[PDB]
């Protein structure tokens, strides 16, 4: 079906974002930000809705996403959190930009 086919494309994108091909810049986004471990004691005051690729993967596996739009909103929320918390000249923001380019260009190839 339409939703199934579009969610197959989303699952393909998710696998690519987690693949060794993109590991050099994807690694900050693999797991939830551990604010306490990183000494970022303001992270949860600034970021109300944390998101990361392991959470997107669990939601995809649990059939939480009913359509491609819901999946894309979570992937974009993950990048937006990075752009909100970190100064724009920081290394992690450059890595976010690169992984979001991978995401946006392949998401744009969504089947109709
Ligand atoms: C605030 C935080 C963030 O937005 N993200 C997405 C996650 C990390 C992070 C750190 N450890 N892990 C396992 C992930 C991260 C990494 C760096 C630098 O170390 C990048 O070089 C800087 C800032 C962050």
From Swiss-Prot:
It is found in: Nucleus; Chromosome. This is Bromodomain-containing protein 2. Changing residue 38 to A: Reduced binding to histone H4 acetylated at 'Lys-12' (H4K12ac). It comes from the Eukaryota. The first bromo domain specifically recognizes histone H4 acetylated at 'Lys-12' (H4K12ac). It also specifically binds histone H4 acetyl-methylated at 'Lys-5' and 'Lys-12' (H4K5acme and H4K12acme, respectively). The second bromo domain recognizes and binds histone H4 acetylated at 'Lys-5' and 'Lys-12' (H4K5ac and H4K12ac, respectively). It comes from Homo sapiens. The lineage of its organism: Eukaryota, Metazoa, Chordata, Craniata, Vertebrata. Belongs to the BET family. Homodimer. Interacts with E2F1. Interacts with (acetylated) STAT3; promoting STAT3 recruitment to chromatin. Interacts with CTCF; promoting BRD2 recruitment to chromatin. Signal peptide: none annotated. Chromatin reader protein that specifically recognizes and binds histone H4 acetylated at 'Lys-5' and 'Lys-12' (H4K5ac and H4K12ac, respectively), thereby controlling gene expression and remodeling chromatin structures. Recruits transcription factors and coactivators to target gene sites, and activates RNA polymerase II machinery for transcriptional elongation. The chain holds residues 344 to 455 of 801 of the full protein. Residues 1-110 form the Bromo domain. Some specific inhibitors of BRD2 that prevent binding to acetylated histone are promising therapeutic molecules for the treatment of cancers or inflammatory diseases. ABBV-744, a small molecule, has been tested on tumors with success: ABBV-744 antiproliferative activity is mainly restricted to cell lines of acute myeloid leukaemia and prostate cancer and is able to displace BRD4 from chromatin. GSK046 (iBET-BD2), which specifically inhibits the second bromo domain, is a promising therapeutic small molecule for the treatment of inflammatory and autoimmune diseases.
């Amino acid at each position: 079906g339409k939703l199934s086919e579009q969610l197959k494309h989303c699952n393909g994108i998710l696998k690519e974002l987690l693949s060794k091909k993109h590991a050099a810049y994807a690694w900050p986004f693999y797991k939830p930000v551990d604010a306490s471990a990183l000494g970022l004691h303001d992270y949860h005051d600034i970021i109300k809705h944390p998101m990361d690729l392991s959470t997107v993967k669990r939601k995809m596996e649990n059939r939480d996403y009913r359509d491609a739009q819901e999946f894309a909103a979570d992937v974009r929320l993950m990048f937006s959190n990075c752009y909100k918390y970190n100064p724009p000249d920081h290394d992690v923001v450059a890595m976010a930009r690169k992984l979001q380019d991978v995401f946006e260009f392949r998401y744009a190839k969504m089947p109709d």
